[PDB]
C-alpha cells in the first residue's frame, strides 16, 4: 500500500496527460451514473419526503463542502473517495451537467 499522498500524486500524474490532452472533456476518476438515469422522476416516496426537506443553506457549518455533498446525496450523485482532493469537483460536474441537459430539454 501507499500514502494517500502518494496516491493523489499518482492520480495527478495520470490526469496531467489526459486533461491537458483533451481540455474540452472531463473523465471521471471513478464511474459516475448515466445522465439520463439521473433524469428519472422522483419515486413518489422520495418526492414526498422532499416536500418537507427545507434547504439548510444556512446551517452554521454546513460549510460549502458539506452542502455540496448533501446536494449530491439528494440527487444520487456519488462522492467518491478518489481523488481525495478533487472528488467534490467531479461530483459537482455531474450535477451541473444534469442541470445543463434539463435546461436543454426545457428549451424544446
Amino acid at each position: 500500500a501507499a500514502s494517500p499522498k502518494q496516491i493523489q500524486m499518482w492520480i495527478n500524474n495520470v490526469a496531467e496527460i489526459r486533461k491537458t490532452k483533451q481540455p474540452h472533456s472531463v473523465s471521471y476518476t471513478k464511474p459516475m451514473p448515466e445522465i439520463d438515469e439521473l433524469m428519472q422522476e422522483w419515486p413518489q416516496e422520495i418526492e414526498e419526503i422532499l416536500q418537507h426537506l427545507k434547504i439548510p443553506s444556512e446551517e452554521l457549518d454546513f460549510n460549502l463542502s458539506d452542502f455540496c455533498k448533501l446536494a449530491c446525496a439528494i440527487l444520487d450523485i456519488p462522492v467518491h473517495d478518489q481523488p481525495n482532493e478533487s472528488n467534490v469537483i467531479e461530483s459537482l460536474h455531474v450535477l451541473f451537467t444534469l442541470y445543463s441537459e434539463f435546461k436543454s430539454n426545457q428549451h424544446f
Partner: protein, 65 residues
C-alpha cells in the same frame, strides 16, 4: 442556433479540469455564470446561494406531474 449547449459543455469541462476541492467557491460561481444561473440568484456572491438555486431547480425538474 442552440448548442450554445455544446459551448457551455466544453467550457464547463475546461473549468472542471482546472479545479480541486480548494476552488469550490470559485468553481460554483463560474459554473453559475456558464449556466446563466448567476443572474437569477439574489446573492450572486455567496456560493451556497448559487448551488441552492441549481439544486431546487433540479428537484422541481424531476417531479412527476
Amino acid at each position: 442556433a442552440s448548442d450554445e449547449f455544446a459551448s457551455e459543455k466544453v467550457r464547463l469541462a475546461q473549468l472542471t479540469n482546472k479545479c480541486n476541492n480548494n476552488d469550490l467557491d470559485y468553481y460554483i460561481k463560474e459554473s453559475g455564470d456558464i449556466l446563466g444561473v448567476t443572474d437569477k440568484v439574489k446573492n450572486k456572491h455567496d456560493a451556497k446561494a448559487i448551488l441552492r438555486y441549481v439544486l431546487e431547480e433540479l428537484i422541481n425538474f424531476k417531479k412527476l406531474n
